[PDB]
Structure formats: structure tokens, C-alpha cells
């Protein structure tokens, strides 16, 4: 069972928040709302559906941070002409994953930017 301010779904407790935070601050904030707290993660289609529905019922049209950060930073970026990647001119340094309260599709946004979010903890 979950705290009255959280919503349960298959042995997990979820709670959306309104105060916009960049990805890092949101995640950290989550860890401070209950033991073992973190940004929500999706292991199934039904779970994500439940979270979307909740976010919408809670705040309506909006966007919320998901527990995935620096998603392409560990990928292998390289010049097709095989030149050493040295000079950098990135508009953004890292991207993070979020979803909008209307559907369960994964979208991308710069991690330094802000968004609402959903926190989660087990059992």
C-alpha cells in the first residue's frame, strides 16, 4: 500500500510533481520524497499507460521527466570522413527522456531544460 499522496500500481508508488526542474534536480528531488525514490521508469506498456493517465488527471496537458538521462552521450559520435572529434560546438550537451500526459510515446529534451515529473518507489 502507498502513502495517501501517492498512487499505487503493481507494488510500486507513483507521484507527479508540478514544480519544473531540470533532469538532475528532478531525479535528486525524487530521492528525497521517500526511501528508494527516483524518477519513474517504464518496464511495460500498462505501467506507462497508468502513469500517463495519472499525470493527466493530476496536471492536465504538460510534460514530465522520465528516469533516462544522457541518452546519446555514450553513443559513438564520429565524422563520416573519419576525422578525430576534437573541436566541439554542441548547441546542447545532453538529452533526457520525457513523456507528455496525452500519450505514452518517448520524446527527447535537453537535460538542462525544465519540466514537470513523476517520482516512484518500490513495495
Amino acid at each position: 500500500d502507498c502513502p495517501s499522496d501517492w498512487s499505487s500500481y503493481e507494488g510500486h508508488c507513483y507521484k507527479p510533481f508540478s514544480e519544473p526542474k531540470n533532469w538532475a534536480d528532478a531525479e535528486n528531488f525524487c530521492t528525497q520524497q521517500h526511501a528508494g525514490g527516483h524518477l519513474v521508469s517504464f518496464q511495460s506498456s500498462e505501467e506507462a499507460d497508468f502513469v500517463v493517465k495519472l499525470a493527466f488527471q493530476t496536471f492536465g496537458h504538460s510534460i514530465f521527466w522520465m528516469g533516462l538521462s544522457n541518452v546519446w552521450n555514450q553513443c559513438n559520435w564520429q565524422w563520416s570522413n573519419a576525422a578525430m572529434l576534437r573541436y566541439k560546438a554542441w548547441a546542447e550537451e545532453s538529452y533526457c527522456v520525457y513523456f507528455k500526459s496525452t500519450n505514452n510515446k518517448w520524446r527527447s529534451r535537453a537535460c538542462r531544460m525544465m519540466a514537470q515529473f513523476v517520482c516512484e518507489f518500490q513495495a
Binding site: 531525479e27 528508494g36 527516483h38 524518477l39 521508469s41 517504464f42 518496464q43 511495460s44 506498456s45 506507462a48 522520465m66 528516469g67 533516462l68 538521462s69 544522457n70 541518452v71 546519446w72 552521450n73 555514450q74 553513443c75 559513438n76 559520435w77 564520429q78 565524422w79 563520416s80 570522413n81 576525422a83 578525430m84 572529434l85 576534437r86 573541436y87 566541439k88 560546438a89 554542441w90 548547441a91 546542447e92 538529452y95 505514452n104 510515446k105 518517448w106 520524446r107 527527447s108 516512484e120
Partner: protein, 129 residues
Amino acid sequence: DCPSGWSSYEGHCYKPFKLYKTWDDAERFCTEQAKGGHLVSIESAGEADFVAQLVTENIQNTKSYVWIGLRVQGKEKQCSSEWSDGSSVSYENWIEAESKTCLGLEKETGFRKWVNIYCGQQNPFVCEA
């Protein structure tokens, strides 16, 4: 010197194309334009200036991004093994175009900033040999 149509800058030849293609068709197209041809690579501020200048004067009225040769090599939607809670990443539900693993310049930032964009987009570009 560089062939008629191409412009020179410290040992290389460049040519802009106001042609709309995906990153792959662009890169392949560039390889066909010159021996050793590829999508433009930017390895210095001076070179970045030279490219921005070329784009500014030759690729206009397209309202799009401009392809550069920097991108993630594979076809993955991402390179992340686990969520912030430590659990492993299996289930995924990306909107094809939300996975931006290719870079392109834009007018807004004076064609001097690399923007993460969907490789399936059909934008103009610049080749370099």
C-alpha cells in the same frame, strides 16, 4: 585551387547543395561528388566560420537544418543501459523522429551550432573533399 563550383579553405574543397535528403542519402551523395567526398566536417573555429559563411550566402530560403558529417554510427534509438533507479532497460517506446542522433546547423544560431536532429529529416547540406 578546387574545381569550378567548389570553394577552398586550408587544404580542402567545399560545395553547398540546396538539396533535400536524409543524412544517409546526403553522405552517399557527397561521396559521389568528388574523390574522397563526404558531408562537411568541422574541426576548428576558423573552419566553422568558413562553413557558416558558405551556408549563409549559398543555402537560403529552405527553412531547414544543414547536414554536417557528425553523427552516431549505429541505428540505435539510444545508448543507455539502465534507468536512474538501477533497473535494466528493456521496454522502449520511441517516436522515430524523437531520437535525434544526427547533427545539422541552423540559421537561428548563425549556422555555428550543432543541433541534434532526426537523421530521417530531408535537409540541404555541404560536401567536402
